[PDB]
Amino acid sequence: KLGNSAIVTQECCAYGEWPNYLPTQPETATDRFYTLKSVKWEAGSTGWWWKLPDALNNIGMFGQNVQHHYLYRSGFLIHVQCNATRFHQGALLVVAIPEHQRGAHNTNTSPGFDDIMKGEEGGTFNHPYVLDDGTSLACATIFPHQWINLRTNNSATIVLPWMNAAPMDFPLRHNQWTLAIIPVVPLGTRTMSMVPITVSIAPMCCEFNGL
Amino acid sequence: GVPTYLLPGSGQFLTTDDHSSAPVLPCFNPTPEMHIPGQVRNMLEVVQVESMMEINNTESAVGMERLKVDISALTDVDQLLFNIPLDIQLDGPLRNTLVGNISRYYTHWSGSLEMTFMFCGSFMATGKLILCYTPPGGSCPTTRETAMLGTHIVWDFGLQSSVTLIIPWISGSHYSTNANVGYVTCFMQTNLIVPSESSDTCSLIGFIAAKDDFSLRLMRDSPDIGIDHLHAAEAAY
Amino acid sequence: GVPTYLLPGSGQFLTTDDHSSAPVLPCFNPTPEMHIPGQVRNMLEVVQVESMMEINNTESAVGMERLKVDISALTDVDQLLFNIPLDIQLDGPLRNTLVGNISRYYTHWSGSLEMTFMFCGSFMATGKLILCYTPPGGSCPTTRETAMLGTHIVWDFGLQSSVTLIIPWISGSHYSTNANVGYVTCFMQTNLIVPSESSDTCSLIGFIAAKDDFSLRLMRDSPDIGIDHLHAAEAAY
Amino acid sequence: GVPTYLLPGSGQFLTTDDHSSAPVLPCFNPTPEMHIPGQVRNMLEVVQVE
Amino acid sequence: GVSETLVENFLSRAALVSKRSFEYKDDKNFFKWTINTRSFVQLRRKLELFTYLRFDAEITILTTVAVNGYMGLPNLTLQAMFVPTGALTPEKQDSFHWQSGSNASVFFKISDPPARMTIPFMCINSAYSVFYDGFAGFEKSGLYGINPADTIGNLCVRIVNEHQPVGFTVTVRVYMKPKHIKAWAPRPPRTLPYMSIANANYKGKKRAPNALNAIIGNRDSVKT
Amino acid sequence: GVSETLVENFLSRAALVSKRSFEYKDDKNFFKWTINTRSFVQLRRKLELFTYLRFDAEITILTTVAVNGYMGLPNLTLQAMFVPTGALTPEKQDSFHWQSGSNASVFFKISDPPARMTIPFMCINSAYSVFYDGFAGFEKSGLYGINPADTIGNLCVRIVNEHQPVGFTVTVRVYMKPKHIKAWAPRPPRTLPYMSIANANYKGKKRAPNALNAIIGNRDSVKT
């Protein structure tokens, strides 16, 4: 439970690291679930990707601690929930890619500022089979990942530790992680369904230096 | 001083030698080791992670459609759905996995693989699948009744949603040559019973991870990568 | 005798190597170490000494006039006097100091600098100066009222004659490229109140010293020195 | 055997060097040191004489 | 090592990274090389299995010589000078910058064993960001994935001897070999062919294997 | 070292100090060099950060050879002889003074590794007076700043072989590298360009930077 906004209930972690503080350390301002917009998962939906903390420069006391702090240091605690009934079938891969250097298809030109920086809007995979960077989705379970199989569960929980070689980073140009939700098995029902996928990001162990 | 004489093999650059050498910038203190999460000390931590097989391997399977095998209500009672040739050193479903991209950097692999299938249909979808493991050299089953020969399990995906199928020791390339190295075969047992509101075309996805006894040795370069000229050629010069 | 073989990298003159070598005049006793005062064992004793910044950096500032910023009775209540870009690796007020001529022999600098200003007006001169530190990437203040954003101090030079302004950790070249690396900004707060007998054009001088946590690493040659032919050329031959 | 590499300054004849060298007639016993009077161990015995 | 799957053994095979048959006669009289991971795609695909690395590269300059279509091969003197990410490179073959008292040259002859220096962990951060999801500097014009805390350095190599060296072409091979490798956060192995040495663009082959829409070669049916 | 700011590490980079492509044929057949601090202004500006020094210079003679605009390069024998501040230098290339039983020659071949001797702390006083505020000797004609307790020595180098060596020009590089540096009383770094190798004259550039009346490049105003 994080912040005055009681949203979801957690205690799956990642990299064996529950976040601890390894100066401004927010614990009631930023440590709260910033629920994003719920994206409509249909039958022909390819994927979605949110680059953290680029998705949180806009929203909340974390967003004020980006515009008023030059260097940040934060781990995350993320929570994806896919509210579908007992007649929907489908499977998501909620994968959290560290340093997702995306690729541009078929050209020699690197991605620009308006292909990598989206923010709260998120984005969408174009070739999700190779994760938009030439690798493979079939091997993409080496990351911190979690399965939303709508037969079994409908929710996910990944913890994202501080993933930089640097001790602290500046937020408006670099993005550590990349939450990415790829429907492996596409959604099915006979009526032919816009099932929503709600993403709540909660920062953990925030530090901010340089007013 | 010290009377020394030169052995044969003196002055050679053997590429895989390991001697201490002259630092080009001594009295430099590099940046200390900040605790970065998720260290790999051994590539058998990378291999033992599960990863999706590509079990719908047909022609006209485009993109994401290749990972998942569709079963439906209009399949025969004991129609063969798929089979997985265990060519971890060659072409097949296992080539683009974690267990089969690290083991293409090696020559001899050996250990128990671990398959995990996961049904991805609706909550009401019931039926059974029989999952046969054919040991190498044996006969690939066609009838469901002659499929009872070695190890096989009847998997009811109405109750379970995921089964784990241990493949035993295989010992690898102990014989470059095409042969018969195992199969994992999955027939329909009953039918697909979905209600009138769920979609009648359900799907399976399959995973593979090596276990603790997996052992790779003798290192060679990967056959996967090659082909053409790259952009920014000579731009590092 | 001893069977030896030559490693690759044998017979090379690496310029930064450190082996004991053959003395050209052995059984020579050089002059003993008489205790000469003021030894430097570390260049961070040379850096941490304060030294004058050059904060009046304009055109038509000739010679000694460049070190001191003139304030006078005919300046606006909140007119900007100076700002100090913290380009310790580049051009600016900090280039000809002790902290910024040793740190041009290096590549990565990091630590708390320490600025010290010293008012050099008459004994009766009163007034206040507000001294803003703008952290890097931030906005350079123009109005005195929006100048209250980060660290800043109101310095009354009627009471004090010297203020100490710690600049915090900066970490240096962690990003050869122009950017925004800090500012120290000093506005008028009140006015300059000198009596009718003292001179109405007072002056400030500013100092900078690195603190104990200053750290330089990776050594390169200085960009400052170069250009032309020297006198007594070939007179050492 | 022993992995060695040649430093710069290898193969040079520096005239004022002092290493043990190869005797041209080993297993030769030279004449022992008969006590000859007036040894000079230091040239500051030669200088300090008037 | 204990196993041959250990990361120290998996990566520290000495790999060729540069090869410049530079012609010296009487800019083009020498070569430099930006030391980067992205040179030869056999080693590049192995270093891009990991996100963060920390390795002391050793560099083993092998210099050959060959007569063009005079019977003896001259024993020249060379200079492989490691310019880091700091001061300037020599603009000419005999400029002032070769005589720098800070760049650490090596002075090796052709008839010696191959020269060898060890460039240490050369970064600002605690690891090499192999993949960088950000932008350099401040502008929107900073290219994607180019971190200045990733360039190991430069390696300017020249022939020390003077001109009129007549048409014996000097082919210089340079072998990088990581040491003390500590590798963090592994990644999926790249399956599509490369486009540039700068970024991770993807095009695929025309048909399977290693194509965009099908990575494994197509069998006839699932019951094959 | 413990830090890279330590004085032993700050100064002991090996720097080029002499380079004489002396032509030997059948005074001018050899070269000498007065060993002094004031040779190359990249190292000179670092030694003039301090007032008093105490360093064992090592000298690493690198000898090359090159054919002029005959296909093989001859492997000559050289002699780098350290004449201190005492007895006479050889006036010719084959005089009597090369055969001196007190000057400590080295006898190195071209095809060897580079020769290397270590000249110790060579002074009369307890330190090298880099800056000397006095006058030599007794007269008013003693020049300013020239201390006889500052010359390290001389370094006469010749080719040992006889004449008729035909037009292969011998370029000899000499690398000084201080050792065991003890440095006393630091100084302001010199900001104006040099005039001579003898004294500290100052002229400045024409305009800033590094000019007489303005050392930092002029910005437009103080509120820039």
Residue numbers in the entry:
A (entry chain C): 17 to 27, 32 to 42, 53 to 222, 224 to 242
B (entry chain B), C (entry chain B): 1 to 175, 184 to 234, 236 to 246
D (entry chain B): 1 to 50
E (entry chain A), F (entry chain A): 53 to 78, 87 to 129, 135 to 289
Task: Copy text verbatim from the article accompanying this structure deposition.
EV-D68 is an atypical enterovirus that usually causes mild respiratory tract disease, but is also associated with severe lower respiratory tract infections and acute flaccid myelitis. Following receptor binding and endocytosis, virus particles uncoat by forming a proteinaceous pore spanning the endosomal membrane through which they eject their genome into the cytosol. In this study, we showed that EV-D68-947 is a dual receptor-binding virus that can use both sialylated glycans and sGAGs as receptors. Structures of EV-D68-947 were determined after incubation of the virus either in the absence of a receptor analogue, with 6′SLN (a sialylated trisaccharide), with dp6 (a heparin-derived hexasaccharide), or with LMWH at 33 °C.
